[PDB]
Amino acid sequence: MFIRIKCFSKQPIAKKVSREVSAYLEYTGNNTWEGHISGQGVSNLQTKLINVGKGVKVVCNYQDKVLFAIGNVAMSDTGSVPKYTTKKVYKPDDSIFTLKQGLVGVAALWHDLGKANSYFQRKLRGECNPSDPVRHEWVSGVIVSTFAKGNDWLSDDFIIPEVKHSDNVFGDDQVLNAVLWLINTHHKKGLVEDPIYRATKTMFTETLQCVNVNGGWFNYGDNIDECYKIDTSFITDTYVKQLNRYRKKLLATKHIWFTLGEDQKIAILQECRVALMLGDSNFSSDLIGGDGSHLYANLDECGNLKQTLTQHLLGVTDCALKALFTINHHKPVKANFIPTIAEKGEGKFAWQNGVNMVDSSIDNMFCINMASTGKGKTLANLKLLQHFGNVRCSFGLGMVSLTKQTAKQFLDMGVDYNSAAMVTGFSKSRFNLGSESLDQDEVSVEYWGQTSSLSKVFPNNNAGFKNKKLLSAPILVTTTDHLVKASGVKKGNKQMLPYVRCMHSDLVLDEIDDYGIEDMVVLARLVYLTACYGNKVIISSATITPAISNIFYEAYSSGYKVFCANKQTTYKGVNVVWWDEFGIKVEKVTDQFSNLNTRFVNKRITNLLESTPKHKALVVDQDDNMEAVKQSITTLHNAHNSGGVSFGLIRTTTIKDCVAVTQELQNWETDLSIKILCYHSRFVGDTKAQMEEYLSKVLNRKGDEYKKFVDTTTPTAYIVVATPVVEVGRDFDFDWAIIEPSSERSIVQCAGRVLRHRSSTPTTHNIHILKYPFKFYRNSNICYDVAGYESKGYKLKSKNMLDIYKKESIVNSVNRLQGDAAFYTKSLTALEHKVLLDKLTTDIADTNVFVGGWQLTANPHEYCKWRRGTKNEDLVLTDGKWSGNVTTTKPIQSKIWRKWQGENGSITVPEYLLDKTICYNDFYGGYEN
Amino acid sequence: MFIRIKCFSKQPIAKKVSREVSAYLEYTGNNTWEGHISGQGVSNLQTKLINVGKGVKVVCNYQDKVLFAIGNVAMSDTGSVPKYTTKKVYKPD
Amino acid sequence: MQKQILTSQKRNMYILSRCKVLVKNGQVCHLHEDGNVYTVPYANTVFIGLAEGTSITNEAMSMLAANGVIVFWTKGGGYDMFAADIICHLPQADYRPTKYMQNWVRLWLDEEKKLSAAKEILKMRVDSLSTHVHDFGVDVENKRVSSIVNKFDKGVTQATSFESLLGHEGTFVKSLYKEYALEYEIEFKRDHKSADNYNKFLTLGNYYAYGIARSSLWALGIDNSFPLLHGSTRRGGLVFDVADIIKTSIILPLAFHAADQGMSNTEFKRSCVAYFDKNDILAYLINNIKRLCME
Amino acid sequence: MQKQILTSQKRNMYILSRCKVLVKNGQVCHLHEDGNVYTVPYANTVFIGLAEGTSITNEAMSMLAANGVIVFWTKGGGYDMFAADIICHLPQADYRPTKYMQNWVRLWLDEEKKLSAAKEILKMRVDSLSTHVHDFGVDVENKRVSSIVNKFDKGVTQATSFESLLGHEGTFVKSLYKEYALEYEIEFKRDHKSADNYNKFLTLGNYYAYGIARSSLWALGIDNSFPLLHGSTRRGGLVFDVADIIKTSIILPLAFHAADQGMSNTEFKRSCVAYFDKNDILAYLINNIKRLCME
Amino acid sequence: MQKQILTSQKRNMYILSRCKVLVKNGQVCHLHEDGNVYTVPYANTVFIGLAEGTSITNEAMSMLAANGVIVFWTKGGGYDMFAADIICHLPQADYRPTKYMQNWVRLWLDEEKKLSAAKEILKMRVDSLSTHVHDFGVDVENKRVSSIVNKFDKGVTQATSFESLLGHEGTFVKSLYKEYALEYEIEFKRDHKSADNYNKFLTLGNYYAYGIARSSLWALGIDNSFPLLHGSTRRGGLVFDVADIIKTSIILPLAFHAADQGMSNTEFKRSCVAYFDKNDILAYLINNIKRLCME
DNA sequence: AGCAATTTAAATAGGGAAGAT
DNA sequence: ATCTTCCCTATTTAAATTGCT
Ligand SMILES: [Mn+2]
Ligand SMILES: [Mn+2]
């Protein structure tokens, strides 16, 4: 590897970086180094070139592509190394940036006018309840609305009038309404409980007129008259001139505001709100010290009076203005040019040369990567990102362990920690034992990286470790919940960090089908927000349903419409890149996405069907599923075994179902040597982790290394009874599976856990589908709702899987890929597709995906909750002693193959099952006994 | 013929030689030019690099051997381009 | 300027994209829309090109022309099949050698002499293939390429009309383009308005060969306005004969290799510089028109 | 220093001549008498030889040894005829991995295991020949080299002692010296004291392969006092035993090519860096000596 | 400055600081800081050391190595050496490992001499305790310390395996730690990660002990990959095993005195090297390794 | 619009002195 | 001695402005 490093630096920051860059490369003179070094040498040079201080101006070239660029060095657009760069390059009708500046400046000088009431003064001094009857943002909104109703609010002297209690402060003037919504929602968004309003309201002001004081601001309301008697000590020199210059800025630019569309207004006001909380939290974090008394805004850690309200308003204004400037004029730090990506894929990765069919100069890209598992999907996503140049992306993945797997792939192929940042925000205690030096695994949290210039506008220089890893990451391999808060939050400033993260970075969401329906709705909201700033969305899901692919394209198309009309460019359409392991297709799609997507789906189906059938599923006829499991285990051991040894996966639905199947199979008298494992999610930290590592090392069938992790000498049935934790994110390879039916994507995923690593075709049948789910004996009205898309609004007419599924069927992604809306009441696949198009629709609703008008409100974050689960309290095992109503028990010790013990950790119990003892056990975790 | 010209010059004698050396070679940045040219192009570049005045500090490399060295530039004894250049070196009998 | 580098030994080669071309402090440079000023070596430049969003000034054009750099503008194609119109500023202030134009005129006006020159220039692409052999792509001396160039030479030997030359021209272009398509395992159709990389790399090489051909013709004073091959489809001037002498030998395998390896356009620019410089394709074209003119 | 480039993954190697090596601003840099201070990439350096007229401070050795750079001197016993003591300081402050010493000395003490290991390292000569081919010199697959490699293998298979081994070395090296010389049309007698380029380039490559071999030894912890070849003219230890794996495959073809193609000492030195990092010879010798000790 | 260290019997390990070593009038001298030159007699020295502020030249290096004066580079103090070559039987006449080295290897190989040498290294560690009596430290003749000594002597003499010797060695070492903690009125528990004065002072004193044991192992040519107590996978375990002899006899009382009076690190370094120079601790380790390896 | 003259100023290089090891 | 830190020391680059064509 031959590199060349050039320095642009002034100071002796052309000198103390010269020591480190002259420790690793030869000096060719004139502050230019050039030579041969290894990739780990590149990583070491990066780590000790960035850590040496601020102001390092370093460009590296590997062959002729730029390896890395330290700082905001413009470096190369076409040629490299410019001459002098001075000022005044373009200076356009910027319009919408002047609009955002005027809105943020006018609102930020009015965002805390409502702290001047006597209640907030005695709240800061501390002789009343610290919770206000009406929040000060609403009081400042009442001030601004009363001033606007009285005088002309855009060109007049200010003077705060006598204000009363107003239920609504939103009128008709679109720009005033924007300023009012920025003022009122500078801490939290208003929440609308009204069902008719949630049913009908769509527009900007027409929804904003329904935002009343009862949506969170009106806490208790007994001291309203003191909350609206206000002093007017803000009339000073610099506050009045700042208010005048920003109001006239808005006055001069609001003529382009009425030429915007609804989508524009929503996205622009979201940006304005994010910059306003950025400036407000930035000025509230630091201590300024000086004060002019008689009025105060915030308190220090000692509770003393600080940050008087005139200079508080001025500081929040300038900090929000500077926030806006750096978030709207940033050339963000991108990743290194990974040299182990750009070469050809060989063999089964040979489809990854589809990036040589995509244009490298497209400003936008919507990848739908429909490639099957085991083909290197995430490597292909990184290849697609690097085809357009240097990489800046957020790999948002479900589960901690899947982020760990993608991080380990990124580490061992070409990516160091100067470009990658693995973020899992829980600090799990799963450590690697055996040998620390001989590990060559366990990707960790260090991020030598490079701190971006956006950290100076965040509160108190961003944060410590976690938010520095969030914001400053070129490549952010993260759990997805660090990105879905970009679309907005209930309370606080947790929106700004993923918002500013997704503003300048691409978004790569892998296996989006494993998320929930509301989770997928907020993920497509994130896709729309990412496309709002021209970034590229890579979706990587093999079993995509047309509905999902369509609504994600429509979210990207609305976002790219926002980005196109935001830079005053005519919208040519979205560069959609359909991708699988058989080919690629790049089309400029502005309309008719459905026929092209279904034609690619049909081409992928015909490229999947002439291949040999790997998963032949038979739906059993035996009604009782206990003895159906027995007979199917006996049949698939007598048919599918490797010299007497067979691996079976009993995929069931819930935990007590799993322990019921386990306790039946343990007490089942047979000549077969059944060896039973329980693989559900309710387990203690230690025990769970141990199951994972063992299962990953015994079900690895790409080699014969497993022969030494199990007793393959004696003919044995190694059976793993598992819940849907096996069908998501597990690289497992079973000889056969017996599936309790809950949803068709569960069938396709548990087919993907059988012969995942081998290529031998089954002869007779490798999957035995149960006749009924076990909830049929508990609830015959609805049985597929647990881990399925059946529900109270979408009920199957019959629950028989002979009626709702094929008796003999080759299970692949084809049934999920096709998409059928008719006959959803008597087939599982059409039931699935129905729900997917009836929840992820092209409407705005309130919990929908095109959400417009409601982004202003708190409604999409309350009624569409990301990871909406049950109450979930956590019973914690502390050194062998349980906390709550747990009561350790003893398992049946009949056929347990492996049982790992646990002493620490915690189990997640729903509040429903907290009533009784969860009865934790070493073999199977939680049950009802 | 592929050459590479580096400049050691102070003054705007890093500037008015830059016009002539940027008339004949592409600019690779950091006062270093590199590109393909003919031998008569080398002769023309020499003639209008030397005649431009006194203080021209130009080293040219053809492949890896030094093509020419304008001035008393120490340039290369083994490696090329020193760094912390100084005075006081040997001081013998 | 002493002895300005003979045009045939001029080496630098650019097509400037999305930058206003100007002069700072003596040298011709181009300034992009981010503040970056990259200098142009005008004494060694063969041609510059101007893509969308480009804007050159007066004294920059003067310093290119008086030094002898042919300058064109890439856009202008508006038909469905043809590279329609490329606008090209000739440095005529340098007074040109004359008798090569007289020889070209004495062969152009005589119809049987134009046909004879048409003959030799059609087999000139055949010998271009034989001389300029790449390390990648196809091998020239295989059975299929030799069979098609043998059929081409046999047909162009017995040809007697320019429309027969146009037909045989079409079968030659279809034969080569499709054989390269077969080698690189793609389906290929030559459309100048296509998003596929094998096509816009071919249009970029069309612009590159256009610039090479006007520098070769201007180095001997030959105008584009004397096309020895003419027709309804083939109406571009002499540049659409001295430019596509070197498609199927130089550009089209290089365009297919660049669209197969699939990095950006700049590696294709630099590869065109490298192959036009290493094998001296400009001096090769000039010397071929030299042995054309005096025979 | 974080992880520090693995010493097989260091690519820079130097032999400095007529300079004062010191540390400026924490920089390993050699200063000549003309006032020129050239830095050295000490965290990427494999070795720094020091020729006549050289000098180095303490701190330069301190931060070369902390970065794992082997420093030797080309005088003393560096006349290369006796090859007794080329003064070669190693960084033993770093506590090296031990297991290669253990397997190496288990086979050393056992004389039959030493004889077998010597045969493996003698076969590594022809292995090096086959792996590292050169396109500017002797083809390895011609009849003379294949015949002499076959004769060398059939002689070293039936070998009984180290005196028999010493003789097979005479044959291989001397006749490969000669075979190159007859193909390079030069009457050549190997002489370390000779002035012709065919010998000064050979001694420079001897020092370069000395540095590569000694860095490969020290990497594994292997010393030099445990050689596999014992003889009257084989004074010098294990570093020459590792180094003469890559005379006739690398050092000798590069030296012969250099002399024939009139390279200067500087470019021969560089050609040596290019071959030692393009084929990754340091990792080759390190992995192959792991194959040698192993059990 | 100029510093003399007796090592075996008659040869002296010269340590040179703040001086420039070169050749004057045909023999090796060095200019010192005061501008006064000092020569060196070749007969009385074999090891010559280059401390901080010291540069040597090439012909001085060559003439020093041709006179049997083998040079090493060390951090200032003379007992923190980072660069040297390997002792042979003779520096010019032949290249053989030293008798001490070979004896060590043979003793290490056969399991019985390895066990006997492990017992012996602990016998001489108890001897070291008594031999090097300090003033500020605890009395070695005290009843508790003598009981610990006799417990260690019984445990080493009655043991037949290495892990028993490791448990007994840890018991003795931390029992002396407990005794010195009982002296200096502190709760002392040995951990490397603590930032208190006693633990970090003992850590850097242990690093000084590792340096002087490394010099003593190098000076008889003993390699750093044959530990007696520590495992085969422990990198540089023989340095730790030899430094164990003086860790609890010299480093521990000096470190506890240094943390008791609380002075800084450089003056603890000068106290450690003053104790090394005054009582000839390196010469004690040299004679210790001779008596171990000779048996 | 490019440039030139010409100021203005920020920074780069170097030498001497003193303090560390 | 070697090397580092810092203070002169002024020498040396980059920007800035502005008539002039
Ligand atoms: Mn507030
Ligand atoms: Mn505030």
Chain D contact set for A36 (CB, 8 A): 11-12, 273, 277
Tell me which amino acid residue C234 is: R
Cβ neighbours around C25 below 10 Å, total: 13
Cβ neighbours around A91 below 10 Å, total: 7
Q: Residue A793 burial (CB < 10 Å; 0-12/13-18/19+)?
A: exposed
Q: What gap in Å lies between CA E141 and CA E133, rounded to an integer?
A: 10
Q: How far is the CA of C289 from the centre of ligand 2 (A)?
A: 78
Chain B residues contacting D via beta carbons under 8 Å:
63-65, 74-87, 89-90
Query: What is the token pair recorded at A737?
Result: 């599976």
Chain A contact set for C35 (CB, 8 A): 74, 82, 85-86, 89
Q: What gap in Å lies between CA A402 and CA A410, rounded to an integer?
A: 12
Closest CA to A858 of A210, A109, A220, A276: A210
**A377 contacts A512 by C-beta, under 8 angstroms:** no
Beta strands in A717-775 (DSSP E): 717-722, 736-739, 767-769
Nucleotides of G under 7 A from a protein CB: 1-5, 11-16
CA angle A522, A527, A528 (to 5 degrees): 95
Residues A359-395, buried b or exposed e (16+ Cβ, 10 A)?
A: beebebbbbbbbbbeebbbbbbbbbbbbbbebbbbbb
CA angle A190, A192, A194 (to 5 degrees): 165
Closest CA to E35 of E19, E24, E49, E48: E19
Q: What gap in Å lies between CA A99 and CA A267, rounded to an integer?
A: 12
Count Cα neighbours of C165 within 13 Å in the Cβ-side half-sphere: 21
Q: What gap in Å lies between CA D191 and CA D199, rounded to an integer?
A: 6
Give residue for tokens 């997507």: A597
Angle formed by the axes of helices D252-260 and D197-220, to 10°?
150
**A738 contacts A768 by C-beta, under 8 angstroms:** yes
CB within 8 Å: D35 and B90: no
**C28 contacts A78 by C-beta, under 8 angstroms:** no
Q: Which residues contact A359 (CB under 8 A, 6 or more apart)?
A: A575, A586, C195, C197
Say whether residue D79 is in contact with chain B using an 8 A CB cutoff. Answer: no
Q: What gap in Å lies between CA D241 and CA A791, rounded to an integer?
A: 78
Q: What gap in Å lies between CA E12 and CA E283, rounded to an integer?
A: 10
**C207 contacts C187 by C-beta, under 8 angstroms:** no
Which residues fall inside 7 Å of strand F, measured at CB? A 9-12, 14-15; B 84-88; C 22-26, 57, 59-60; E 18, 52-53, 75-76, 266
DSSP H helical segments within E5-81, as ranges? Answer: 58-66
**E87 contacts E70 by C-beta, under 8 angstroms:** yes
Q: After which residues is chain A broken (C to N over 2.5 A)?
A: none
Q: What gap in Å lies between CA E121 and CA E243, rounded to an integer?
A: 10
Mode of pairing for the β-strands spanning A674-679 and A616-619: unpaired
| Cβ of B13 near strand G (distance < 7 A) | no
Q: What gap in Å lies between CA A740 and CA A628, rounded to an integer?
A: 10
Count Cα neighbours of A260 within 13 Å in the Cβ-side half-sphere: 28
Q: Which residues contact E123 (CB under 8 A, 6 or more apart)?
A: E153, E156
Q: What gap in Å lies between CA A582 and CA C36, rounded to an integer?
A: 42
The reply, when asked if residue A513 is annotated as ligand binding, is no
Distances (CA, A) of A365 to A80, A187, A418, A480, A573: 26, 34, 26, 20, 10
CA–C1' B23–F4 (A): 20
Beta bridge partners of D50: D16, D73
**A850 contacts A554 by C-beta, under 8 angstroms:** yes
Closest CA to D281 of D249, D234, D258, D254: D249
Query: What is the token pair recorded at A132?
Result: 């206000």
Q: What gap in Å lies between CA A583 and CA A607, rounded to an integer?
A: 10
Q: Which residues contact A878 (CB under 8 A, 6 or more apart)?
A: A904
Collapsed DSSP state (helix, strand, coil) of residue A48: helix
Distances (CA, A) of A750 to A63, A698, A740, A812: 46, 17, 10, 10
Cβ neighbours around C192 below 10 Å, total: 16
User: Nearest 5°: phi and psi at A802?
Assistant: -70, -35
CA angle A278, A281, A282 (to 5 degrees): 75
Q: Residue D291 burial (CB < 10 Å; 0-12/13-18/19+)?
A: exposed
Distances (CA, A) of E78 to A36, E21, E220: 37, 16, 16
What is the nearest CA distance from D18 to chain E, expressed in angstroms? 9
Q: What gap in Å lies between CA A886 and CA A926, rounded to an integer?
A: 9
Q: What gap in Å lies between CA C112 and CA C116, rounded to an integer?
A: 6
Collapsed DSSP state (helix, strand, coil) of residue C199: helix
Q: Which of residues 86-125 of E touch strand G (CB under 7 A)?
A: none
| Chain CA centroid to CA A668, Å | 44
- The technique by which this structure was obtained is cryo-EM
Q: Which residues contact D36 (CB under 8 A, 6 or more apart)?
A: B74, B75, B77, B82, B85
Q: What gap in Å lies between CA E224 and CA E99, rounded to an integer?
A: 16
Distances (CA, A) of A748 to A512, A514, A767, D111: 15, 12, 11, 64
The DSSP secondary-structure symbol of A134 reads: B
**A325 contacts A317 by C-beta, under 8 angstroms:** no
Q: What gap in Å lies between CA E237 and CA E232, rounded to an integer?
A: 8
Q: Which of residues 74-103 of A touch strand G (CB under 7 A)?
A: 84-87
| Chain CA centroid to CA B14, Å | 10
- Do A and C share at least 3 CB pairs under 8 Å? yes
Q: What gap in Å lies between CA A629 and CA A661, rounded to an integer?
A: 8
Q: What gap in Å lies between CA E85 and CA A56, rounded to an integer?
A: 40
Per DSSP, the residues of A794-857 read S--S---HHHHS-SEEE-SSHHHHH---SSTTS-HHHHHHHHHHHHS-SS-TTTSSS--SSSSS
Neighbour order of strands in the sheet with C37-39: C37-39, C27-32, C19-24, C55-56
Q: What gap in Å lies between CA C83 and CA A615, rounded to an integer?
A: 53
Chain B contact set for A69 (CB, 8 A): none
What is the nearest CA distance from A456 to chain B, expressed in angstroms? 30
Q: What gap in Å lies between CA D284 and CA D287, rounded to an integer?
A: 5
Mode of pairing for the β-strands spanning A881-882 and A873-878: antiparallel
DSSP H helical segments within A151-185, as ranges? Answer: 174-184
Q: Which residues contact A438 (CB under 8 A, 6 or more apart)?
A: none
Q: What gap in Å lies between CA A544 and CA A837, rounded to an integer?
A: 12
Q: What gap in Å lies between CA E234 and CA A594, rounded to an integer?
A: 65
Closest CA to C176 of C229, C252, C245: C252
Q: How far is the CA of A143 from the centre of ligand 1 (A)?
A: 14
Q: What gap in Å lies between CA A188 and CA A862, rounded to an integer?
A: 12
Q: Which helix (H) or strand (E) covers residue C219, if one does?
A: helix C197-219
**A477 contacts A487 by C-beta, under 8 angstroms:** no
Beta bridge partners of E45: E12
D60, closest nucleotide (Cα–C1') = G2
Mode of pairing for the β-strands spanning B2-7 and A906-909: unpaired
Give residue for tokens 């038909």: C79
Say whether residue C41 is in contact with chain B using an 8 A CB cutoff. Answer: yes
The DSSP secondary-structure symbol of E225 reads: T
3-state per-residue secondary structure call for D31-43: ECCCCCEEECCCC
User: Nearest 5°: phi and psi at E245?
Assistant: -60, -40
Distances (CA, A) of A244 to A111, A158, A248: 16, 9, 6
Distances (CA, A) of A236 to A147, A240, A244, A291, A314: 18, 6, 12, 14, 11
CB within 8 Å: C41 and B40: no
B82, closest nucleotide (Cα–C1') = F13
**A177 contacts A171 by C-beta, under 8 angstroms:** yes
Say whether residue D95 is in contact with chain A using an 8 A CB cutoff. Answer: no
Name the residue facing D85 among E53, E65, E106 (closest C-beta): E65
Closest CA to A24 of A7, A11, A43, A37: A37
Q: What gap in Å lies between CA C45 and CA B22, rounded to an integer?
A: 11
Cβ neighbours around D241 below 10 Å, total: 22
Q: Which helix (H) or strand (E) covers residue A238, if one does?
A: helix A237-253
Name the residue facing C44 among B15, B19, B37 (closest C-beta): B37
User: Nearest 5°: phi and psi at E204?
Assistant: -75, -25
Cβ neighbours around D168 below 10 Å, total: 18
| Chain CA centroid to CA A350, Å | 29
Q: After which residues is chain B broken (C to N over 2.5 A)?
A: none
CB within 8 Å: D87 and E61: yes
CB within 8 Å: D96 and E235: yes
Q: What gap in Å lies between CA D185 and CA D247, rounded to an integer?
A: 20
Per DSSP, the residues of chain D read -TT---GGG--EEEEE-S-EEEEETTEEEEE-TTS-EEE--TTTEEEEEE-TT-EEEHHHHHHHHTTT-EEEEEEESTTSSS---EEEEEE-SS----HHHHHHHHHHHSHHHHHHHHHHHHHHHHHHHHHS--SSS--TTSHHHHHHHHHHHHHHHS--SHHHHHHHHHHHHHHHHHHHHHHTT------TT--SHHHHHHHHHHHHHHHHHHHHHHHHT--SSS-S---SS-TT-HHHHHHTTSIIIIIHHHHHHHHHTT--HHHHHHHHHHHHHHTTHHHHHHHHHHHHH--
Q: What gap in Å lies between CA D192 and CA D86, rounded to an integer?
A: 14
Q: Which residues contact C110 (CB under 8 A, 6 or more apart)?
A: none
Q: What does R_g of chain C's alpha carbons equal in angstroms?
A: 19
Closest CA to A757 of A482, A455, A374: A374
Beta strands in chain E (DSSP E): 12-16, 20-24, 27-31, 37-39, 45-50, 55-57, 70-75, 80-84
The reply, when asked if residue A637 is annotated as ligand binding, is no
Q: Which residues contact A464 (CB under 8 A, 6 or more apart)?
A: none
Closest CA to C159 of C121, C123, C127, C115: C115
Chain B contact set for C286 (CB, 8 A): none
State the sign of the Cα–Cα–Cα–Cα dihedral A387, A393, A397, A403: positive
Q: Which helix (H) or strand (E) covers residue A191, if one does?
A: none
